Design a protein around this ligand. Structure first.
Ligand code: BGL
Ligand code: BGL
Ligand code: BGL
Ligand code: BGL
Ligand code: BGL
Ligand code: BGL
Ligand code: BGL
Ligand code: BGL
Ligand code: BGL
Ligand code: BGL
Ligand code: BGL
Ligand code: BGL
Ligand code: BGL
Ligand code: BGL
Ligand code: BGL
Ligand code: BGL
Lengths: 231, 231, 231, 231
């Protein structure tokens, strides 16, 4: 365990630093900016490169909703969960700190006013979507995410392909939901960035813990008590 | 069969929710929108992530044209077809419903006036292309799609790579045909979205059932009676 | 041979129809257009999906420069070359014909004036680059392309990954050279489209036969008499 | 060794010619330009296609920070390092020369004034970021890069997937850091292009040798003395 947690910490740090870093540093860059499609690719790739680099160690969760989701689907032991969830929040926060430091090297930076890539709904939704819209998309996408993780980790097809299926799945998820909640489906990622925004983000933070997790559990039971295995 | 259909339902739901969701939620977002290239990537990725997650269960069709296409090429039994085709239409429609619900959380939403990512030709073609143009591209692309599916499912090269070849093939198909018909090549996907547009989409719906299917059958016989196997 | 040629024909048709189709149908679409990055992805993906679908049959060349390049590197028999090169030109031309038909379904279409995705230099170069610039980039990129094909087909690492390495390599090649020559590195692709442009394209056609081929041969000998094998 | 160096030379040439070529030839092309997301994809793909083509020969470094990084992590012998580092700088410079020649075929070209895709900080940073910001991102990203390389080269999961994990990792790195330093994490790449810019680039060159390397060493020891192996 004194090695599987390091991978957890270093993985969620990569995800935050990369995904959110692309969001605050290059998403809106004038003319040459990467936009949502670029940030969506980044997030997915942080997971794909780390799932290949440290997946054969901790399993490549880098997400509390994924950990607690592998538990519900009956594939990840209990109490080890807490160890992962904490390492995930820490790694994300560290990354968010260095990110904030890097972004501060440019005149006019304002993590409060800009949002600092924080997830939010209603008045804090990128496309101005209602809290209902945020709940539905976040839940469905979260459920589907874990459903793909489970099927891809199943012992009947992948065989080294899981990193690609999971990483691209996260990319797809951002191509859909960024306009709604800016896309979370990962409590560790929402917390890491809400802390530095220190305002409204920290007030809706609770939402991106429950829905992502609930949805994640739903998807774990769906594949468990409805798909494969049987015998 | 009480497990292969669930995968069919959950797969076509993923495809619709994701592909069409990106189309109605983020394709045209101001400045940071993903555009056609983004929607094209999304569609392809829904198939790729689900083909890896539930392909080793149902075969990963998520498309009536693909099912009926694997039958013509002589690789998919009869009557089981009907079971798949229905599960595919249901999953798509469910997704279209939740999508409509999510999109409704934003002021000014109008599935009738916006089209709601519906396929269409002539006056309902994105680039204003004639019905002829729609027929040709939809047929050729549909035939090629199934031709790639067959070769990638062949027992002489892939070996776990089929999900990538099929998923990217669908992405490619949207990079070409969105301006023409908004890209269908999947009856289940055209129906799911035409129902909520409830106007012209439901009037041209028939077109995106026959051509996609006919073209799909053409491609299944082309690889069967012209490529590989032999012995 | 009465099966390996069909794959050749159907593959180069896919490449032209898809790569050039994205170029003339969606590259410049208003606001939502895919641009060069989109066309570059399309071209690469036509090769990747067909290399997986019909590569375990003909080897997946879909390019005269690749065929004649595998011969120089000492990996592809003679005279069979002519069989491939002809099937490649035919498949490309057929696709170019259907493409022209599809593009004609939209008011204002003009293959002569628009260029119809034709390769060219000097006054017919997208970025207005000199013939020298066209020669260098086309040669280097063509040499590198075949160098990657050879190494990826080598029996010491890939093992089913060749389609990905070759397909993405072609994508990369378009991200660099479209502004220069609109990117050719494939005689079959330049001919298929120059015929319908019927003007200047048919006058510089010769250039995109020799350089692509010469460069292709250079890369085949470089990997042969400088890399791997030895024993 | 008289074969592993050729791959080193030809690989770093590919990386420079492709990555930087896309940067100077098509990144800013009017309306249809590929932007940062396009250049980021190019760089990553040069590594991915060459890692598959000549990785089973030299190991696919194409980067002095990667070579010296595999040494610190205890996976790459000494003195052979110097052989690689030199072949890498040469290949990059050759490519930079041909690139400069190609770019010269277009009226108004000015490698001094345009920067010629050179890395830089402060007043020479694309987004105008402080030297501190440049140090942090370059170090972290460099450390993470080698951390992914090590885990992906580990003998417990990849098995032919390393090229994908490493190539996409470099893409991700550019989606984040281009606005800051224009992204280096590769001394050979910074030198190849600074020589032709011949001005400020050659004055900050030292920075993109030390930080990339230091960060690279940090990541090599992190995976070595903190992750996997054990027994
Ligand atoms: C490893 C480094 C961890 C450091 C954690 C730092 C947390 C700082 O958190 C504070 C917020 O709570 C505050 O409201 C905002 C805005 O003014 O400023 C941040 O820096
Ligand atoms: C891991 C860190 C746990 C985060 C929980 C933070 C709870 C604080 O929540 C409060 C909000 O309720 C308050 O209105 C805003 C206004 O600026 O200040 C926040 O810090
Ligand atoms: C492991 C760390 C767990 C962090 C969970 C943080 C949950 C957020 O908790 C905060 C509350 O404390 C705050 O007062 C309300 C106001 O509406 O906003 C919530 O989001
Ligand atoms: C570990 C994550 C659990 C988060 C604990 C959240 C405790 C507070 O939860 C309440 C919500 O239930 C309430 O409806 C909203 C606003 O209307 O205010 C929040 O603070
Ligand atoms: C599982 C949920 C399935 C629900 C299916 C709902 C189908 C509704 O279908 C109707 C259309 O027929 C109508 O014309 C349009 C526009 O006013 O409104 C839609 O909601
Ligand atoms: C699975 C659902 C089957 C869909 C078949 C729908 C057939 C209805 O088709 C009619 C059109 O012909 C009519 O002109 C339009 C105008 O608003 O109304 C539609 O509902
Ligand atoms: C399994 C469900 C099959 C759905 C097939 C729906 C076919 C569409 O059918 C409708 C007709 O009923 C309508 O009146 C005409 C008008 O031109 O438009 C067609 O598209
Ligand atoms: C299951 C899908 C089959 C669809 C059944 C379609 C039945 C109606 O089909 C007719 C077409 O043949 C006719 O030409 C067009 C418009 O000119 O009107 C349609 O409604
Ligand atoms: C299988 C179908 C193959 C058909 C080949 C058709 C070749 C036509 O080629 C002609 C050009 O030579 C002519 O100059 C241009 C512009 O006016 O018109 C084209 O259609
Ligand atoms: C496979 C088809 C072979 C193509 C070779 C074509 C050679 C014709 O080349 C001539 C040019 O030299 C002439 O100036 C232009 C002007 O419109 O007309 C072309 O058709
Ligand atoms: C298998 C088919 C081979 C096709 C090769 C076509 C080569 C092009 O050949 C044409 C010449 O015939 C024409 O007159 C000159 C004018 O400068 O332009 C060339 O490109
Ligand atoms: C099969 C492809 C071979 C192509 C045959 C080309 C024959 C003509 O080649 C000549 C070139 O050598 C000449 O320099 C240019 C223009 O300055 O005119 C061309 O037509
Ligand atoms: C294999 C080819 C290697 C050739 C190396 C050429 C190095 C040239 O380097 C010079 C710079 O030092 C000079 O300041 C700039 C700007 O005026 O011009 C460049 O060409
Ligand atoms: C492999 C090549 C090694 C590169 C090291 C170059 C060291 C030269 O460094 C000087 C700078 O210090 C000087 O101020 C600028 C101004 O134009 O000129 C440069 O050439
Ligand atoms: C193998 C080749 C190694 C190249 C290392 C080049 C290091 C750059 O070295 C130069 C110095 O020589 C110059 O005078 C200062 C000015 O501030 O700028 C540095 O970047
Ligand atoms: C091989 C790469 C090593 C590079 C050698 C660099 C030697 C010079 O290094 C100095 C830096 O230490 C100094 O702080 C900066 C500017 O303030 O000027 C540079 O030239």
């Amino acid at each position: 365990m004194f090695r599987k947690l390091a991978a957890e910490c270093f993985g969620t740090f990569w995800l935050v630093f990369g995904g959110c870093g692309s969001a605050v540093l290059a998403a809106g860059f004038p003319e040459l900016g990467i936009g949502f499609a670029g940030v969506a690719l980044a997030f997915g790739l942080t997971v794909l490169t780390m799932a290949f680099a440290v997946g054969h160690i901790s399993g490549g969760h880098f997400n509390p909703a994924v950990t607690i989701g592998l538990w519900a689907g009956g594939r990840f032991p209990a109490k080890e969960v807490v160890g992962y969830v904490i390492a995930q929040v820490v790694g994300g926060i560290v990354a968010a700190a260095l990110l904030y430091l890097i972004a501060s090297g440019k005149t006019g930076f304002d993590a409060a006013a800009s949002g600092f890539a924080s997830n939010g709904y209603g008045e804090h939704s990128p496309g101005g979507y209602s809290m209902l819209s945020a709940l539905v998309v976040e839940l469905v996408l979260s459920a589907g995410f874990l459903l793909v993780i489970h099927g891809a980790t199943d012992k009947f097809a992948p065989a080294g392909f899981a990193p690609i299926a999971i990483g691209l799945a996260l990319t797809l998820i951002h191509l859909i939901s960024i306009p709604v909640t800016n896309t979370s489906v990962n409590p560790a990622r929402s917390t890491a960035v809400a802390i530095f925004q220190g305002g409204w983000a920290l007030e809706q933070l609770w939402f991106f813990w429950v829905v992502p997790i609930v949805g994640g559990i739903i998807g774990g039971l769906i594949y468990r008590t409805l798909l494969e295995k049987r015998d």
